[PDB]
mmCIF file of C-alpha atoms in Angstrom:
data_model
loop_
_atom_site.group_PDB
_atom_site.id
_atom_site.type_symbol
_atom_site.label_atom_id
_atom_site.label_comp_id
_atom_site.label_asym_id
_atom_site.label_seq_id
_atom_site.Cartn_x
_atom_site.Cartn_y
_atom_site.Cartn_z
ATOM 1 C CA UNK C 1 16.823 -39.937 -28.053
ATOM 2 C CA UNK C 2 15.178 -38.498 -25.053
ATOM 3 C CA UNK C 3 17.965 -38.098 -22.574
ATOM 4 C CA UNK C 4 18.348 -35.659 -19.413
ATOM 5 C CA UNK C 5 21.570 -34.750 -17.681
ATOM 6 C CA UNK C 6 22.762 -32.657 -14.696
ATOM 7 C CA UNK C 7 24.994 -29.749 -14.016
ATOM 8 C CA UNK C 8 25.768 -30.439 -10.419
ATOM 9 C CA UNK C 9 26.469 -28.038 -7.765
ATOM 10 C CA UNK C 10 27.404 -24.453 -8.799
ATOM 11 C CA UNK C 11 30.173 -23.683 -6.655
ATOM 12 C CA UNK C 12 33.447 -22.966 -8.968
ATOM 13 C CA UNK C 13 33.325 -19.135 -9.701
ATOM 14 C CA UNK C 14 32.557 -17.587 -12.939
ATOM 15 C CA UNK C 15 34.768 -18.491 -15.897
ATOM 16 C CA UNK C 16 35.401 -16.059 -18.893
ATOM 17 C CA UNK C 17 36.682 -19.152 -20.666
ATOM 18 C CA UNK C 18 34.598 -20.655 -23.548
ATOM 19 C CA UNK C 19 31.950 -23.312 -22.802
ATOM 20 C CA UNK C 20 33.838 -25.747 -25.109
ATOM 21 C CA UNK C 21 35.461 -27.817 -22.360
ATOM 22 C CA UNK C 22 35.239 -25.067 -19.785
ATOM 23 C CA UNK C 23 34.739 -27.015 -16.441
ATOM 24 C CA UNK C 24 31.879 -28.992 -14.960
ATOM 25 C CA UNK C 25 29.942 -26.273 -13.345
ATOM 26 C CA UNK C 26 30.985 -22.648 -13.660
ATOM 27 C CA UNK C 27 28.262 -20.097 -13.418
ATOM 28 C CA UNK C 28 29.303 -18.069 -16.398
ATOM 29 C CA UNK C 29 27.864 -14.886 -14.501
ATOM 30 C CA UNK C 30 27.296 -14.329 -10.781
ATOM 31 C CA UNK C 31 26.302 -11.179 -8.883
ATOM 32 C CA UNK C 32 25.554 -10.739 -5.154
ATOM 33 C CA UNK C 33 25.988 -14.584 -4.493
ATOM 34 C CA UNK C 34 27.486 -15.800 -1.252
ATOM 35 C CA UNK C 35 28.886 -18.884 -2.744
ATOM 36 C CA UNK C 36 29.709 -21.593 -0.358
ATOM 37 C CA UNK C 37 30.269 -25.217 -0.312
ATOM 38 C CA UNK C 38 27.465 -26.273 2.110
ATOM 39 C CA UNK C 39 24.909 -23.526 1.094
ATOM 40 C CA UNK C 40 25.288 -23.853 -2.664
ATOM 41 C CA UNK C 41 24.637 -20.400 -4.032
ATOM 42 C CA UNK C 42 22.790 -18.067 -1.420
ATOM 43 C CA UNK C 43 22.554 -14.033 -1.906
ATOM 44 C CA UNK C 44 25.174 -12.019 -0.498
ATOM 45 C CA UNK C 45 24.606 -10.823 3.262
ATOM 46 C CA UNK C 46 23.025 -7.516 3.889
ATOM 47 C CA UNK C 47 24.553 -4.354 5.043
ATOM 48 C CA UNK C 48 23.955 -2.587 8.328
ATOM 49 C CA UNK C 49 23.707 1.257 8.752
ATOM 50 C CA UNK C 50 25.406 2.329 11.852
ATOM 51 C CA UNK C 51 26.167 6.144 11.401
ATOM 52 C CA UNK C 52 26.950 8.963 9.031
ATOM 53 C CA UNK C 53 30.334 10.646 8.454
ATOM 54 C CA UNK C 54 29.648 13.797 6.459
ATOM 55 C CA UNK C 55 29.231 15.046 3.241
ATOM 56 C CA UNK C 56 30.057 13.863 -0.530
ATOM 57 C CA UNK C 57 33.403 15.904 -0.338
ATOM 58 C CA UNK C 58 35.141 13.754 2.306
ATOM 59 C CA UNK C 59 36.373 10.732 -0.006
ATOM 60 C CA UNK C 60 38.023 11.478 -3.036
ATOM 61 C CA UNK C 61 40.008 9.399 -5.558
ATOM 62 C CA UNK C 62 43.197 10.510 -3.961
ATOM 63 C CA UNK C 63 41.872 10.163 -0.293
ATOM 64 C CA UNK C 64 43.901 7.852 2.174
ATOM 65 C CA UNK C 65 41.747 5.826 4.542
ATOM 66 C CA UNK C 66 43.790 4.056 7.157
ATOM 67 C CA UNK C 67 42.376 1.559 9.696
ATOM 68 C CA UNK C 68 43.874 -0.017 12.805
ATOM 69 C CA UNK C 69 42.743 -1.847 15.786
ATOM 70 C CA UNK C 70 43.728 -1.684 19.522
ATOM 71 C CA UNK C 71 42.895 -3.809 22.444
ATOM 72 C CA UNK C 72 40.294 -6.709 22.686
ATOM 73 C CA UNK C 73 37.712 -5.584 20.090
ATOM 74 C CA UNK C 74 36.934 -2.136 21.874
ATOM 75 C CA UNK C 75 39.165 0.404 19.939
ATOM 76 C CA UNK C 76 38.832 0.687 16.126
ATOM 77 C CA UNK C 77 39.748 4.065 14.429
ATOM 78 C CA UNK C 78 39.359 5.270 10.861
ATOM 79 C CA UNK C 79 41.803 8.084 9.764
ATOM 80 C CA UNK C 80 40.694 10.084 6.528
ATOM 81 C CA UNK C 81 42.978 12.363 4.823
ATOM 82 C CA UNK C 82 41.958 14.775 2.316
ATOM 83 C CA UNK C 83 44.400 16.460 0.119
ATOM 84 C CA UNK C 84 46.145 19.417 1.610
ATOM 85 C CA UNK C 85 44.748 18.992 5.041
ATOM 86 C CA UNK C 86 45.298 17.385 8.497
ATOM 87 C CA UNK C 87 43.851 13.776 8.836
ATOM 88 C CA UNK C 88 40.486 13.467 10.391
ATOM 89 C CA UNK C 89 39.721 10.471 12.916
ATOM 90 C CA UNK C 90 36.242 8.599 13.423
ATOM 91 C CA UNK C 91 35.513 5.901 16.037
ATOM 92 C CA UNK C 92 33.385 2.660 15.940
ATOM 93 C CA UNK C 93 30.142 4.654 16.134
ATOM 94 C CA UNK C 94 31.156 7.300 13.763
ATOM 95 C CA UNK C 95 31.492 10.108 16.186
ATOM 96 C CA UNK C 96 34.166 12.370 15.453
ATOM 97 C CA UNK C 97 37.382 12.565 17.616
ATOM 98 C CA UNK C 98 39.119 15.842 18.388
ATOM 99 C CA UNK C 99 42.580 16.356 16.879
ATOM 100 C CA UNK C 100 45.126 18.899 18.287
ATOM 101 C CA UNK R 1 30.800 -9.637 -8.210
ATOM 102 C CA UNK R 2 28.746 -7.441 -6.024
ATOM 103 C CA UNK R 3 26.947 -4.462 -6.928
ATOM 104 C CA UNK R 4 25.557 -1.244 -5.492
ATOM 105 C CA UNK R 5 23.333 1.683 -7.025
ATOM 106 C CA UNK R 6 25.210 4.663 -7.462
ATOM 107 C CA UNK R 7 27.905 4.000 -4.615
ATOM 108 C CA UNK R 8 31.467 4.868 -4.547
ATOM 109 C CA UNK R 9 33.637 2.438 -2.051
ATOM 110 C CA UNK R 10 36.544 4.073 -0.302
ATOM 111 C CA UNK R 11 37.580 0.756 0.858
ATOM 112 C CA UNK R 12 37.010 -2.552 2.467
ATOM 113 C CA UNK R 13 38.026 -3.087 6.133
ATOM 114 C CA UNK R 14 37.592 -6.786 7.424
ATOM 115 C CA UNK R 15 37.753 -6.309 11.239
ATOM 116 C CA UNK R 16 37.335 -9.425 13.297
ATOM 117 C CA UNK R 17 33.697 -10.780 13.403
ATOM 118 C CA UNK R 18 32.668 -7.642 11.137
ATOM 119 C CA UNK R 19 33.137 -6.277 7.750
ATOM 120 C CA UNK R 20 32.968 -2.436 7.957
ATOM 121 C CA UNK R 21 32.109 -0.524 4.591
ATOM 122 C CA UNK R 22 32.704 3.348 3.936
ATOM 123 C CA UNK R 23 30.509 4.059 0.979
ATOM 124 C CA UNK R 24 29.749 7.399 -0.769
ATOM 125 C CA UNK R 25 25.827 7.496 -1.322
ATOM 126 C CA UNK R 26 23.837 9.988 -2.929
ATOM 127 C CA UNK R 27 22.715 11.970 0.245
ATOM 128 C CA UNK R 28 26.055 11.630 1.889
ATOM 129 C CA UNK R 29 28.933 9.273 3.238
ATOM 130 C CA UNK R 30 27.938 6.655 5.570
ATOM 131 C CA UNK R 31 29.467 3.519 7.338
ATOM 132 C CA UNK R 32 27.946 0.407 6.838
ATOM 133 C CA UNK R 33 29.043 -2.961 8.497
ATOM 134 C CA UNK R 34 28.143 -6.364 7.011
ATOM 135 C CA UNK R 35 27.308 -9.291 9.193
ATOM 136 C CA UNK R 36 28.582 -11.438 6.429
ATOM 137 C CA UNK R 37 28.677 -14.525 8.988
ATOM 138 C CA UNK R 38 24.772 -14.506 8.542
ATOM 139 C CA UNK R 39 23.590 -14.895 12.152
ATOM 140 C CA UNK R 40 19.873 -15.546 12.672
ATOM 141 C CA UNK R 41 19.262 -13.053 15.311
ATOM 142 C CA UNK R 42 15.639 -13.253 15.189
ATOM 143 C CA UNK R 43 12.637 -14.527 13.002
ATOM 144 C CA UNK R 44 12.195 -17.562 10.653
ATOM 145 C CA UNK R 45 14.785 -16.557 8.124
ATOM 146 C CA UNK R 46 17.638 -13.900 7.407
ATOM 147 C CA UNK R 47 17.048 -10.675 6.052
ATOM 148 C CA UNK R 48 18.709 -9.837 2.651
ATOM 149 C CA UNK R 49 18.822 -5.998 2.532
ATOM 150 C CA UNK R 50 21.019 -3.095 1.681
ATOM 151 C CA UNK R 51 21.303 -0.691 4.459
ATOM 152 C CA UNK R 52 19.076 -1.577 7.419
ATOM 153 C CA UNK R 53 17.433 0.616 10.011
ATOM 154 C CA UNK R 54 14.910 -0.574 12.938
ATOM 155 C CA UNK R 55 11.938 1.747 12.948
ATOM 156 C CA UNK R 56 8.861 1.733 15.098
ATOM 157 C CA UNK R 57 5.186 1.398 13.998
ATOM 158 C CA UNK R 58 2.343 3.201 15.841
ATOM 159 C CA UNK R 59 -1.229 2.999 15.285
ATOM 160 C CA UNK R 60 -3.047 6.187 14.106
ATOM 161 C CA UNK R 61 -6.796 6.669 14.612
ATOM 162 C CA UNK R 62 -6.780 9.933 12.464
ATOM 163 C CA UNK R 63 -6.308 7.964 9.230
ATOM 164 C CA UNK R 64 -6.740 4.257 10.271
ATOM 165 C CA UNK R 65 -3.215 3.476 9.501
ATOM 166 C CA UNK R 66 -0.007 2.702 10.843
ATOM 167 C CA UNK R 67 2.817 5.553 10.933
ATOM 168 C CA UNK R 68 6.209 5.091 11.230
ATOM 169 C CA UNK R 69 9.296 7.245 12.624
ATOM 170 C CA UNK R 70 11.282 9.370 10.267
ATOM 171 C CA UNK R 71 13.632 7.468 8.115
ATOM 172 C CA UNK R 72 17.292 8.738 9.003
ATOM 173 C CA UNK R 73 18.571 8.485 5.373
ATOM 174 C CA UNK R 74 17.262 9.538 1.999
ATOM 175 C CA UNK R 75 16.568 6.592 -0.237
ATOM 176 C CA UNK R 76 18.404 6.316 -3.668
ATOM 177 C CA UNK R 77 15.316 4.749 -5.482
ATOM 178 C CA UNK R 78 11.859 5.165 -3.933
ATOM 179 C CA UNK R 79 10.485 1.853 -5.655
ATOM 180 C CA UNK R 80 13.326 -0.284 -4.963
ATOM 181 C CA UNK R 81 13.191 -0.397 -1.276
ATOM 182 C CA UNK R 82 10.711 -2.662 0.934
ATOM 183 C CA UNK R 83 9.702 -2.887 4.458
ATOM 184 C CA UNK R 84 10.197 -6.179 6.633
ATOM 185 C CA UNK R 85 8.179 -6.664 9.868
ATOM 186 C CA UNK R 86 10.162 -8.174 12.537
ATOM 187 C CA UNK R 87 7.950 -7.849 15.738
ATOM 188 C CA UNK R 88 4.192 -7.929 15.616
ATOM 189 C CA UNK R 89 1.354 -10.477 15.234
ATOM 190 C CA UNK R 90 2.580 -14.085 15.587
ATOM 191 C CA UNK R 91 1.225 -14.966 12.143
ATOM 192 C CA UNK R 92 2.660 -12.010 10.337
ATOM 193 C CA UNK R 93 6.113 -12.225 11.843
ATOM 194 C CA UNK R 94 9.068 -12.134 9.492
ATOM 195 C CA UNK R 95 7.090 -11.153 6.347
ATOM 196 C CA UNK R 96 7.224 -8.010 4.340
ATOM 197 C CA UNK R 97 4.243 -5.717 3.709
ATOM 198 C CA UNK R 98 2.973 -3.097 1.245
ATOM 199 C CA UNK R 99 3.361 0.665 2.184
ATOM 200 C CA UNK R 100 2.988 4.092 1.235
ATOM 201 C CA UNK O 1 -30.103 -3.635 2.619
ATOM 202 C CA UNK O 2 -27.838 -0.935 1.544
ATOM 203 C CA UNK O 3 -30.184 2.103 1.727
ATOM 204 C CA UNK O 4 -31.894 3.136 4.889
ATOM 205 C CA UNK O 5 -34.929 5.366 4.969
ATOM 206 C CA UNK O 6 -34.980 7.791 7.734
ATOM 207 C CA UNK O 7 -37.605 10.320 8.973
ATOM 208 C CA UNK O 8 -36.181 12.434 11.544
ATOM 209 C CA UNK O 9 -37.703 15.773 12.153
ATOM 210 C CA UNK O 10 -37.928 18.209 14.866
ATOM 211 C CA UNK O 11 -35.205 18.917 17.503
ATOM 212 C CA UNK O 12 -33.438 15.627 16.946
ATOM 213 C CA UNK O 13 -30.090 16.345 15.062
ATOM 214 C CA UNK O 14 -28.299 12.853 15.395
ATOM 215 C CA UNK O 15 -29.670 9.546 13.730
ATOM 216 C CA UNK O 16 -28.364 6.125 13.796
ATOM 217 C CA UNK O 17 -28.270 3.737 10.665
ATOM 218 C CA UNK O 18 -27.520 -0.037 10.397
ATOM 219 C CA UNK O 19 -26.213 -1.698 7.368
ATOM 220 C CA UNK O 20 -26.214 -5.310 6.103
ATOM 221 C CA UNK O 21 -22.766 -7.070 6.391
ATOM 222 C CA UNK O 22 -19.911 -7.182 9.004
ATOM 223 C CA UNK O 23 -19.399 -4.568 11.712
ATOM 224 C CA UNK O 24 -19.990 -1.112 10.443
ATOM 225 C CA UNK O 25 -20.971 -2.385 6.978
ATOM 226 C CA UNK O 26 -18.731 -0.051 4.885
ATOM 227 C CA UNK O 27 -15.324 -0.309 3.420
ATOM 228 C CA UNK O 28 -14.338 3.411 4.082
ATOM 229 C CA UNK O 29 -15.701 6.563 5.370
ATOM 230 C CA UNK O 30 -16.402 8.237 2.095
ATOM 231 C CA UNK O 31 -18.701 5.360 0.912
ATOM 232 C CA UNK O 32 -21.686 6.944 3.038
ATOM 233 C CA UNK O 33 -23.580 9.451 1.260
ATOM 234 C CA UNK O 34 -26.674 11.384 2.223
ATOM 235 C CA UNK O 35 -29.887 12.185 0.151
ATOM 236 C CA UNK O 36 -32.631 14.617 1.069
ATOM 237 C CA UNK O 37 -35.946 14.788 -0.588
ATOM 238 C CA UNK O 38 -37.626 18.181 -0.923
ATOM 239 C CA UNK O 39 -41.147 16.641 -1.985
ATOM 240 C CA UNK O 40 -40.133 16.524 -5.768
ATOM 241 C CA UNK O 41 -36.803 14.974 -6.271
ATOM 242 C CA UNK O 42 -33.831 13.840 -4.409
ATOM 243 C CA UNK O 43 -30.439 15.801 -4.052
ATOM 244 C CA UNK O 44 -27.512 15.942 -1.888
ATOM 245 C CA UNK O 45 -27.612 16.851 1.566
ATOM 246 C CA UNK O 46 -25.470 19.640 3.034
ATOM 247 C CA UNK O 47 -24.056 20.101 6.645
ATOM 248 C CA UNK O 48 -23.861 16.502 7.565
ATOM 249 C CA UNK O 49 -20.915 14.775 9.195
ATOM 250 C CA UNK O 50 -19.679 11.188 10.222
ATOM 251 C CA UNK O 51 -19.995 11.167 14.079
ATOM 252 C CA UNK O 52 -18.215 7.762 14.534
ATOM 253 C CA UNK O 53 -18.268 4.283 13.332
ATOM 254 C CA UNK O 54 -22.016 4.346 13.152
ATOM 255 C CA UNK O 55 -24.657 6.983 13.350
ATOM 256 C CA UNK O 56 -24.473 10.675 11.959
ATOM 257 C CA UNK O 57 -25.408 13.885 13.521
ATOM 258 C CA UNK O 58 -26.643 17.163 11.685
ATOM 259 C CA UNK O 59 -25.607 20.596 12.569
ATOM 260 C CA UNK O 60 -29.073 21.844 12.944
ATOM 261 C CA UNK O 61 -32.312 19.971 13.666
ATOM 262 C CA UNK O 62 -34.409 18.915 10.430
ATOM 263 C CA UNK O 63 -37.490 20.611 9.582
ATOM 264 C CA UNK O 64 -40.871 18.980 10.385
ATOM 265 C CA UNK O 65 -41.789 16.445 8.072
ATOM 266 C CA UNK O 66 -38.207 15.962 6.480
ATOM 267 C CA UNK O 67 -37.126 12.747 4.848
ATOM 268 C CA UNK O 68 -33.616 11.726 4.265
ATOM 269 C CA UNK O 69 -31.891 8.248 3.091
ATOM 270 C CA UNK O 70 -28.530 6.884 3.980
ATOM 271 C CA UNK O 71 -27.028 5.016 1.154
ATOM 272 C CA UNK O 72 -23.778 3.085 0.575
ATOM 273 C CA UNK O 73 -21.734 3.821 -2.843
ATOM 274 C CA UNK O 74 -18.739 2.359 -3.663
ATOM 275 C CA UNK O 75 -16.102 2.426 -6.401
ATOM 276 C CA UNK O 76 -17.357 0.151 -9.524
ATOM 277 C CA UNK O 77 -14.551 0.474 -11.898
ATOM 278 C CA UNK O 78 -11.558 -0.526 -9.815
ATOM 279 C CA UNK O 79 -11.196 -3.569 -7.457
ATOM 280 C CA UNK O 80 -10.770 -2.615 -3.966
ATOM 281 C CA UNK O 81 -7.412 -4.061 -3.447
ATOM 282 C CA UNK O 82 -4.513 -4.625 -6.004
ATOM 283 C CA UNK O 83 -1.883 -7.453 -5.336
ATOM 284 C CA UNK O 84 1.886 -6.921 -6.028
ATOM 285 C CA UNK O 85 4.945 -9.703 -6.397
ATOM 286 C CA UNK O 86 6.869 -10.263 -3.275
ATOM 287 C CA UNK O 87 4.331 -8.565 -0.607
ATOM 288 C CA UNK O 88 2.309 -10.212 1.937
ATOM 289 C CA UNK O 89 -1.547 -11.023 1.676
ATOM 290 C CA UNK O 90 -3.254 -9.709 4.823
ATOM 291 C CA UNK O 91 -6.734 -10.863 5.765
ATOM 292 C CA UNK O 92 -8.173 -7.163 5.777
ATOM 293 C CA UNK O 93 -7.575 -7.022 2.059
ATOM 294 C CA UNK O 94 -8.604 -10.626 1.130
ATOM 295 C CA UNK O 95 -11.972 -10.393 3.054
ATOM 296 C CA UNK O 96 -12.749 -7.010 2.035
ATOM 297 C CA UNK O 97 -12.287 -7.791 -1.681
ATOM 298 C CA UNK O 98 -14.983 -10.521 -1.510
ATOM 299 C CA UNK O 99 -17.122 -8.073 0.814
ATOM 300 C CA UNK O 100 -16.774 -5.061 -1.815
ATOM 301 C CA UNK O 101 -17.580 -7.555 -4.798
ATOM 302 C CA UNK O 102 -20.655 -8.715 -2.731
ATOM 303 C CA UNK O 103 -21.481 -4.987 -1.756
ATOM 304 C CA UNK O 104 -21.566 -3.735 -5.436
ATOM 305 C CA UNK O 105 -23.919 -6.575 -6.174
ATOM 306 C CA UNK O 106 -26.085 -5.742 -3.516
ATOM 307 C CA UNK O 107 -26.710 -2.114 -4.514
ATOM 308 C CA UNK O 108 -28.057 -3.351 -7.951
ATOM 309 C CA UNK O 109 -30.460 -5.420 -5.869
ATOM 310 C CA UNK O 110 -31.748 -2.378 -4.377
ATOM 311 C CA UNK O 111 -32.631 -0.583 -7.588
ATOM 312 C CA UNK O 112 -29.896 1.731 -7.320
ATOM 313 C CA UNK O 113 -28.231 2.903 -10.705
ATOM 314 C CA UNK O 114 -25.436 5.192 -11.825
ATOM 315 C CA UNK O 115 -26.136 8.591 -13.495
ATOM 316 C CA UNK O 116 -26.000 8.219 -17.386
ATOM 317 C CA UNK O 117 -27.554 4.853 -17.308
ATOM 318 C CA UNK O 118 -29.637 4.062 -20.534
ATOM 319 C CA UNK O 119 -30.601 0.505 -22.133
ATOM 320 C CA UNK O 120 -29.344 -0.343 -25.351
ATOM 321 C CA UNK O 121 -31.620 -3.051 -26.342
ATOM 322 C CA UNK O 122 -35.493 -3.416 -25.855
ATOM 323 C CA UNK O 123 -36.369 -5.630 -22.837
ATOM 324 C CA UNK O 124 -39.174 -8.193 -22.856
ATOM 325 C CA UNK O 125 -41.675 -7.895 -20.243
ATOM 326 C CA UNK O 126 -42.771 -11.393 -20.317
ATOM 327 C CA UNK O 127 -46.565 -10.921 -19.673
ATOM 328 C CA UNK O 128 -46.260 -8.768 -16.339
ATOM 329 C CA UNK O 129 -47.582 -5.388 -14.940
ATOM 330 C CA UNK O 130 -46.301 -1.947 -14.673
ATOM 331 C CA UNK O 131 -47.290 -0.222 -11.410
ATOM 332 C CA UNK O 132 -47.478 3.304 -9.530
ATOM 333 C CA UNK O 133 -46.329 5.529 -12.247
ATOM 334 C CA UNK O 134 -47.186 9.237 -12.668
ATOM 335 C CA UNK O 135 -48.688 10.612 -15.850
ATOM 336 C CA UNK O 136 -45.956 11.717 -18.267
ATOM 337 C CA UNK O 137 -44.701 15.249 -18.989
ATOM 338 C CA UNK O 138 -43.149 15.066 -22.499
ATOM 339 C CA UNK O 139 -44.172 12.965 -25.305
ATOM 340 C CA UNK O 140 -41.419 10.682 -25.024
ATOM 341 C CA UNK O 141 -42.561 9.739 -21.501
ATOM 342 C CA UNK O 142 -44.601 6.632 -20.749
ATOM 343 C CA UNK O 143 -48.336 6.552 -19.783
ATOM 344 C CA UNK O 144 -50.450 5.256 -16.820
ATOM 345 C CA UNK O 145 -54.125 4.199 -17.429
ATOM 346 C CA UNK O 146 -55.137 7.577 -15.482
ATOM 347 C CA UNK O 147 -54.336 9.565 -18.582
ATOM 348 C CA UNK O 148 -56.284 6.977 -20.364
ATOM 349 C CA UNK O 149 -59.246 7.239 -18.131
ATOM 350 C CA UNK O 150 -59.398 10.854 -18.215
ATOM 351 C CA UNK O 151 -59.220 10.976 -22.018
ATOM 352 C CA UNK O 152 -61.924 8.286 -22.102
ATOM 353 C CA UNK O 153 -63.901 10.237 -19.684
ATOM 354 C CA UNK O 154 -63.397 13.537 -21.486
ATOM 355 C CA UNK O 155 -64.550 11.625 -24.803
ATOM 356 C CA UNK O 156 -67.483 10.224 -23.063
ATOM 357 C CA UNK O 157 -68.362 13.959 -21.779
ATOM 358 C CA UNK O 158 -68.393 15.301 -25.390
ATOM 359 C CA UNK O 159 -70.428 12.012 -26.534
ATOM 360 C CA UNK O 160 -73.069 12.960 -24.028
ATOM 361 C CA UNK O 161 -73.219 16.569 -25.233
ATOM 362 C CA UNK O 162 -73.128 15.155 -28.783
#
């Protein structure tokens, strides 16, 4: 026949449904894709290293991490609670905060 | 989906203009922030890079090569990373380069 | 071209050399190599050092009548610069690769050859000459007419006695 066709814009999200009548445009597998209407399918934005917290033992599968914000985008604190211990508090820049 | 090599995510905390990540890397737990609004701070194109630190390059006449400030963290994979220039010759601006 | 014949003897400890090419004319410091001739054969020099981008200085003055040569040897098995995906091309490596490839060709133009070099097939002279060859030492060596002249003269001497 000698035919050509198009898949259109790939902004719908991955689909585990079989290809037989799945949807027009699905991208069966997508990894690290900031997938937006105008930009189509870019790569995910990068990460910025700001500070180090500590050693590997700080976070466990049972560890609570609580976040709260105060004021006009100046105060942000992360509270980390390891099992059988008092909570630990970190600031925006990762500096430890004294707890009494 | 998004992926990271050998990383355990304590939790995601979307705070205003930024997304703060707490991660358990191989050499310790760091706090990483994502500028997922992809602002073009400088250069022709954005940078897609997992964990970013700004280093300084100084000439060295002992071996006729450029030397960099010590890297604050231990990389997961030596071959995986690459370096991107951000301030230098006008022609070479915003381009990666080979290194040892 | 690549080699420079220098005869510096007495008091003087430093010598200056110029090479064909761009700037200092060599890719790296290790390319420069020094040879000293003891009156019989050439051998590697000792005590020399690279003073700067050009010209070298010896630790002691050379003995009277000493002759040395400054040569440029470069790696022949490997290309100077190898390129990788997702890296940037710089003008240093691009120009040097042509310079290196031009440099190695020039070395053969000066008659320099590596050790363990022997021809596999016979070469045709094409009706030309051989010049300035010493008389041979072992039976496998070649011969100049000087040996033939001496043998002919020795033959004549006995013939006169005959």
